[model samples]
Target: APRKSVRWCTISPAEAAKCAKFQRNMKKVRGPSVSCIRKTSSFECIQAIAANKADAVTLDGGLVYEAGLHPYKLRPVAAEVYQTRGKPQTRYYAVAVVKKGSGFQLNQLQGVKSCHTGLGRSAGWNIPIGTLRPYLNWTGPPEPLQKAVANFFSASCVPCADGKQYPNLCRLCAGTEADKCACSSQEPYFGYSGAFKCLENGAGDVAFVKDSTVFENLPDEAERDKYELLCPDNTRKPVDAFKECHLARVPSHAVVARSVDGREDLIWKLLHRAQEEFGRNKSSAFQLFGSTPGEQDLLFKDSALGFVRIPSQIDSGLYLGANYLTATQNLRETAAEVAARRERVVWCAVGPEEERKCKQWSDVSNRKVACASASTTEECIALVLKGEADALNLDGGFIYVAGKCGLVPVLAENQKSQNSNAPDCVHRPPEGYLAVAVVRKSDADLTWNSLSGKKSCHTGVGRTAAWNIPMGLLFNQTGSCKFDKFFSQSCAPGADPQSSLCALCVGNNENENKCMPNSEERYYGYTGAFRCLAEKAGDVAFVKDVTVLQNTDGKNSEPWAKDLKQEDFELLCLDGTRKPVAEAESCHLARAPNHAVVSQSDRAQHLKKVLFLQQDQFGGNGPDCPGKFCLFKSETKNLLFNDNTECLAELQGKTTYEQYLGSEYVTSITNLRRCSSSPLLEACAFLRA
Candidate 1:
């Protein structure tokens, strides 16, 4: 038999002894045999697993979070499910407990004495710390979150977190001298029980605790009437309403292993083989979920009903969820920083509308993201350069400048396909769209060949569809840059502010940010140009085909586009003929590549991962939405990312700007550049080095 034995790492002598008994039990049944290795502390056991000196160990939720962090990078292999809670599943809730007569909601706690079970426990510390982040005013990976919490509370008992420096953190502890505010049971004001006593004795105004504490301590519904739980909605609920009032759900204890070095299949095989024989009253020979008296929770949670294997995609942060991760983030001091960098995604939102959507995105993502706002495309790119921002979705035109300035394309925003044959939205090959010229059917005389000396609306001065493609074609027809003389007036944003090219550009609702190459310009981008055409400000509008389809036939609900019909629009053809909007596939001017997300080269892969995860969480098909903000939906056509984006599809190894933009398109832009220049591009290219 070529079977491998699982090595179980144990922290204390009691656990080591229990592991030895479990090892013998497995041997007797000829199941997956276990070998025991003992270490001084659970952290030492974690290092043992990290060093490959050992293989497996069970840990609490807090240790699972720590183990998932740097140095070891272990993941939970099996989660222990408990029977004490209503569901025979793997989690408990962290709740804020206060006196029924406290007359304060969840938001009113600043300068109050606080009781925490311990510094790092989920209920006592992590959940409470993260939920109160907005009120704490704690600043920094660069400032200790401890200092923020310390200042927020007037007096508190936060065991194991420096009683020496922020002495107020320990002033309310019942213990005295060396035993005072101790991390262990040696301190009278320490754990769930101790914290409750701290609350009961009037030493603190609120107690951060596990949901089960009230029932365990009070043991009677009548006696529990004096207590209540604070809900995140700034409301209070009866003690029994923990399900509705809990701040966050804390995952249960689990067996952890090295992320790369761990054997998931073997661990699951062993756990499955052993659990049926020894789990929870299954066998008197050896009970896996039972602990001997006085040595509680020896290898695992004594209250566990059984074990459930964790999925491969669930990492520490994903497993812990957003709230828990942010809380423990308080104590790291940037020393435990691998998780810090991977912890958050900073989205660079350009313009006021994009900033508003980004704010809602941050809220729905449980603050796993931070939003940065910029007034222009160049400002957003500069934010990325300074590392103040991470990534943003850029149209093909803006992407070239970003690509020219050291930014790399991460993924393209895949729009809804013409067919539903492909099941995977993100992995499907991109269905890029066509750039086309549009004119109202009522203006049936406006054909491509006769569109000279007419007013025009462009997405932007340098964009692939509305600007470069059309202008390049016009230059190819006329051999000169004085084509401005060809068009009587145009809304070509990014042209000189005083130029006739910008004469028709409308700024904003307030008539400001005029001629800027961003959403602030009312006549910028596909939708804006389409709007300009519909409003009869332009004789012909150059935009992608989708712009017409999106805003026409009541597809768009805005004031400008609410009643426009598809038949009201027609596409301009090179053959001097006009066709319906649906004839774009045959009569388009050029096929433009899709708009994509771009970031710094090093952040490309990580940014891709974030965008992909973000899309599935809030994208067009995201389940979290319907109350949560949809990343791909914007009332004004597009903000931050195009509302039509189905998902941020992969680049098919075309990570480079030239490859993604393609040579033909680049050459088209380059030829067009000969006729015109972008001040932003010139400055960025000069600064590229």
Candidate 2:
């Protein structure tokens, strides 16, 4: 059966021209019949579909969703998302403007009503509203301040429209190539925008206008400014001399068909071909962008040129069209918007190598997950569970704790097996007390009790004991380079079934350094979870996160269990790793204002209070180093103790060691001098490791 006619709409002249060009481009493809309408607002265009006035609408996701359109019904495409397959779409970027001296943060728009030159059709308002709504101060009043925000066209707020003009002076008004309204016209420069005019005119506190204008006019603004650009392509704007702009959100502009004999695919193909031709042409409008040809290549490569004018809706067929469009459903950088937000603060051990550990949080940020206090695991877990934070950089146990505490866990730590050890040791215990452990295939006959203190080694010395033999096959050991094998079905595991040397396979190399005397390296090292009292013991005994090691079972006497808190040792794990709980808490002042003392000597005496308390927590004695302790950022390799006493001896004369630390609180070690000099304290200490 032949499909019915389709309907579509466009708001901006650029969009209208884009569709017109698409119509011409698709003229060659024998695809669906088309009807494209140019409307003033993409909102109304999408509204028509929701109201049953049309079957499909081409618009941004936030707009269609905000208009209450059923998301399942809308097929969103981005010029950028399509770029992976070599097709691109078109979009206009908007600039947000604010008055000078206005204390308004991007997240603080609840009380302030905003006016847009083209409010209904503009990406500036829609993009920001979609991005900012979820993060605003939603605690006060009946509705969230972000949701309660009133958005209207600048003309709606004009005095002629029965509304006061620029009441706050941070207004949005119509502008043009000629007499541009100070509020709506783009400011000249990369960051300056019409919002600056609102500040200049003493009108509104913040302004959001078009990016095209801001880049052209910001250099003209005399005041020094610190402004942000909200554009998928900011360099195309004026004053983008330096490409320091962050990619906040990618724009979504698309083509929708209602019906055309099920010809959506063919329609896409035609439009795609047209865009390619236009992009290839030397006279393309994009050339006038007049920026870095290299960057412009990325921009043009990710932009919409034209589309097959589909005026009807139909089922997507298997046939390939000009180019099928799709996009990153969520804007990539919306998660980083630092307004009034309480983020889940997973902490990690700060390490010498920043890249290896730093990459984990980078992955978190990329996933749009929140990473609050980039400090410690205990702090992050507390923040997330207490509702002060929303995301966690935590072990599997702590993540389960969060689920029990009513917060949903977003991402589990990405786990993998290593021949020797893994990097960044950030594994969470699989739910149900499950973990993948590698055991020598030879030891398979021995079961849980077979391996004793014959031999063992963790992936790294700083690694959690979970990787040790007493821990019962924490990670599967494979003889081959490929990681595979298993101890128990605790965490999920996989191995190549074909390889004899896989983590699961065991052979006769038991006496080799890679294997124990009686057991070879677990060719079948990694496998799924197991259920038993022994598994629980394994979790408690083995440390998963190497950064923070506080033995919860301090009083329990288990030879295999090493009490981290019982010993006084400063630790540095992978860089960007969460800070240990006890270590982080140590940074907080213990007794300052509450206790009273005067003079430098008194201050030194006061400092001793904290050191002594830590020493007490450490055990009956004190730091193993036997000197004044100073917490400086150290890396994994250097985390071990210094070899000579002269260094520890020299530390005694180091009065007020607090000055060199990075955090806000000053560290006090006045008592270390007294303790280090004491022969009684020294005689009791184990002279060496």
Candidate 3:
């Protein structure tokens, strides 16, 4: 009897239709029911399955880790098994096959033309590239990995490699320049069989593919004898003996399902019956293991004998194995042509201004520093996790977010005291500016206790002094997430546009891009927040202590701040009192921690050294003085580091993300996050794959 339909997620519409047709035909055999669901990308399919919109989909070992993360929580339910020499196993050997007469061992592969199945595919890219990392002489990020391979080999046909940027990488492909090294089998030299064809046609000296490639391409035993396996130990062996002589053994593709109860059993039942009727050599009507000519590995591996039921206890890590998982992560996480090395620090910069300053820093630092740019702070964090960029200076609030994502603080921004001119005020704990609520002197009755239904302004959402600290305190007191109700109107950039919280924002000279989180919006920063109060658009503005001083008393040239004076503004104290803006040291709400530099713990030491050297050259007291780019001076806005920072101070004993932000601040942010999570935070989580 046909059971309840199990929705199957597919990568394309064609695959979906094919899967559905197969399901309908298979139902006559009295097997489980299945319905195909189409998704544009693998990550989308992962999300679909996690939400129970679709039950399952087969994914590569590299993607399994992404599917297994928090919120998704998927596990491998079955593994596709490739039967080699009549042996069925869950793993396959990544073997580099070559003509026996090539007269070169694995060590002599330099300058030899090569072929790869595709860029970032496990057996094709990860295993071979990782095995040859020492010989490639590649260093991490901003360097293309394909460029390194092209340099190592005289020419190579790596599918999906950018040929315009790195032409030699695709020079060896048999297809035309336009079709050269396409990711799909459409190219003459793509995947295992296509790579083997590249070698067979004498276009490449070596073909990096799994063990079965040679046997499948050159079926005759006499013809197979013409090929040999290149072993990592600098020796060669006949292609048939890949188990002992291979580059690396990697896990096969697997069908993954949600970790929810009974889902595993249901998926297992569907996969088992499908394989039993349509597995290799078992069917002609709806053959699962067969593909049309010129194509390969449709739906499942063409050579797979049957499905191997993955043990219920095996998670994604257990299914892929730790070593293989690391190799795949290293391949996908790193930028093009880069391998792990400590030669330069790749700093992450956000927005146009930061990118411009970072590029200048790179040019002057003698190649000791490089930069990667993102449109927002959260994008920068995602780049850091992927090893594309190394470090970035973040506010205390973003530091909390970074810490949650497993990044740590390496240095703190130390501002010189107005009272003294030392390099840094280091006698006490790294002191920072206070977070204050500012109001026009006209609003004499406004206080922290009487903030309800009042118009407000913030530096930006998720900022320490402005949004997280103040809003967190408000949420804790009233125990509700109805922030739109708490304030009659607000100009809190980065908040939901539909909410009244965005009512006061003036986005980029009154464009539709209102409530934007970044500096793209005119009324969107510390200066923007203060301007809101100065213009009488907001009753109180939440910002840092220096904001008032920097903008008023003829300190700022902006039209709104030139005529304004310190006497025109007052600090609203937490105890329902008002204090002059100059006495903010004791009168402010809280002494929020200073902004700090954040990076992956793996490259912490390298990043810290490079940043210290760069800062020493461009710091407040650098030899260059004011001629070159100044790390602390900004014409329009703050760049990578705060404009007022005197120096980047050493962290006390490598203070972690939590310790640097303080226990109380971390607790407060946690409470705030519980009440209202950042949409950017959710985007960052989705990018973790």
Which regions of candidate 2 are displaced past 4 Å?
1-7, 12-21, 29-33, 38-40, 49-75, 80-117, 120-123, 126-238, 241-271, 279-689
- For residue 685, give model 2's deviation from the true position in Å: 54
In the order shown, what is each candidate's alpha-carbon RMSD? 19.1, 19.5, 11.6
Residue 659 Cα positional deviation in candidate 1, in Å, after optimal superposition = 0.8
Q: Model 3, 1-689: lDDT tens per residue?
A: 54456888875444565687687666689677788787654567777887878878876565676667665788877777767566566677778988888968988888888888766666777778877877887775357666788889888888767788978887877664556555455466666776778887887788878778777766699888887888877899878878878877877778888866537777888877877777455666776666544655545566666666675545655455444665655653443434433457888787664787889888877767789788778877766765657788888898888887677888887765466566553323467778888778877987768988888888788888689878887877777687777888888877788878888888666466777667766676677788788878878887887878877878878776789878998898888877888887777878888888887776776777766767767766566737776876565366666667777778776468778887888887877777677644553332221
lDDT of 1 by residue, 633-680 (tens): 677558866778777788878777888888888666777767677555
Best by TM-score: 3
Candidate 2 per-residue lDDT, tens place, 423-492, comes to 2212222111121122222222323333322222222111112332222222222321122223332221
- Please give the range of 10 consecutive residues that has the lowest summed lDDT in model 2: 318-327
Q: Considering TM-score, where higher is better, how would the candidates rank from best to worst?
A: 3, 1, 2
Task: lDDT winner between 2 and 3, please give it.
Answer: 3
Better model by TM-score, 2 or 3?
A: 3
Backbone steric clashes in candidate 3, count: 4
What is candidate 2's CA lDDT for residue 411?
Answer: 25
Query: Each model's number of backbone clashes?
Result: 0, 101, 4
- Look at candidate 1 and tell me the lDDT of residue 478: 90
